[PDB]
Amino acid sequence: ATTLKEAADGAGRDFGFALDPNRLSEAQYKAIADSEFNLVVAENAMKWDATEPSQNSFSFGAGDRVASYAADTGKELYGHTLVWHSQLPDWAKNLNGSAFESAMVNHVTKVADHFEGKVASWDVVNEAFADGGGRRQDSAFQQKLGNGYIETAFRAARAADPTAKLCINDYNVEGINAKSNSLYDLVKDFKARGVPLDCVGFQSHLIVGQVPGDFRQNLQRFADLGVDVRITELDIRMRTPSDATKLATQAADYKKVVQACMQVTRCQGVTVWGITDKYSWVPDVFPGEGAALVWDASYAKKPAYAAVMEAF
Numbered sequence: 148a149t150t151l152k153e154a155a156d157g158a159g160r161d162f163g164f165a166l167d168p169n170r171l172s173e174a175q176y177k178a179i180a181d182s183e184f185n186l187v188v189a190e191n192a193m194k195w196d197a198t199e200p201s202q203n204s205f206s207f208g209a210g211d212r213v214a215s216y217a218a219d220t221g222k223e224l225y226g227h228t229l230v231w232h233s234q235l236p237d238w239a240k241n242l243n244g245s246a247f248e249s250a251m252v253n254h255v256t257k258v259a260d261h262f263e264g265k266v267a268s269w270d271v272v273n274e275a276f277a278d279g280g281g282r283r284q285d286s287a288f289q290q291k292l293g294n295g296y297i298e299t300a301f302r303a304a305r306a307a308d309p310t311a312k313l314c315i316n317d318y319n320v321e322g323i324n325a326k327s328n329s330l331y332d333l334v335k336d337f338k339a340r341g342v343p344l345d346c347v348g349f350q351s352h353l354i355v356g357q358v359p360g361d362f363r364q365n366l367q368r369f370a371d372l373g374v375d376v377r378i379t380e381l382d383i384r385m386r387t388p389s390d391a392t393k394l395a396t397q398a399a400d401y402k403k404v405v406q407a408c409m410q411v412t413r414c415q416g417v418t419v420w421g422i423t424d425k426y427s428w429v430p431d432v433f434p435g436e437g438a439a440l441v442w443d444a445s446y447a448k449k450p451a452y453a454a455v456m457e458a459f
């Protein structure tokens with residue numbers, strides 16, 4: 148294979164990236180997006196703040212751009228994310244009780260309906276759990292509606308889009324731990340009670356030299372519950388600046404992650420949260436950390452590239 152697109156295509160899996168539609172006007176960015184991936188997800192364009200800035204007022208221009216890019220280039224389209232405690236407009240946070248539930252339900256219905264037939268899978272609910280186990284403690288959805296909001300969102304999504312693969316997404320759940328266990332229980336419960344749920348997304352925002360040794364094992368147990376699994380926001384951050392041994396360790400980590408997916412029949416593929424370190428979200432969120440993607444700031448392939456190629 149000459150591109151990661153071919154490598155993934157050959158493995159019968161997806162290799163995607165998080166797209167910022169505005170960067171499509173940047174030649175080198177587009178060249179890589181066009182040639183190295185077979186799947187695309189909106190890094191921000193389809194979130195609540197970007198789609199419903201004011202209650203009942205939707206703005207799909209940005210999300211449409213991402214969707215159009217996918218159809219135009221023949222790539223699968225993944226949707227991120229319908230219900231999430233972050234990047235939630237104040238107007239929504241200002242609602243309570245029935246008013247809030249109705250706003251959530253309508254947001255799911257409107258967005259899912261708008262992209263119906265285009266988005267193949269949705270991160271319906273994102274980051275519902277807490278590190279250490281249990282439900283997230285700073286979520287407007289958890290605080291205003293309690294435990295049942297997740298099921299409500301999934302049922303609402305399925306009603307709006309009868310065929311889309313509906314996933315629940317989270318981070319720090321790549322290995323077996325208290326958090327992934329809480330997620331495992333939810334997934335099992337939903338399948339047992341017939342709640343619409345087809346997949347689980349393992350964000351995989353990892354630290355280099357720290358890939359869980361039980362990654363595949365964890366992916367397999369979720370797959371065994373009767374759902375598909377997918378690595379949705381892969382990036383492995385290191386302490387900056389980068390150097391040779393850090394880049395090599397990172398390359399090794401990327402190989403380990405793609406391998407775990409390859410070892411699970413139901414792992415749909417791997418999506419990296421961005422193309423180049425030039426735009427990666429890590430530095431501004433994790434002080435002193437970065438250089439987490441496959442391409443550096445000059446659009447030069449890093450060692451991680453060959454590792455991903457070999458893994459597929």
Ligand SMILES: O/N=C1\NC[C@@H](O[C@@H]2OC[C@@H](O)[C@H](O)[C@H]2O)[C@H](O)[C@H]1O
Pocket residue numbers: 190191273318350352380420428
């Ligand atoms: O870990 N969980 C997530 N991580 C990255 C999130 O995407 C970021 O959201 C904030 C924006 O300012 C950034 O541009 C964007 O990369 C993702 O939505 C979430 O699931």
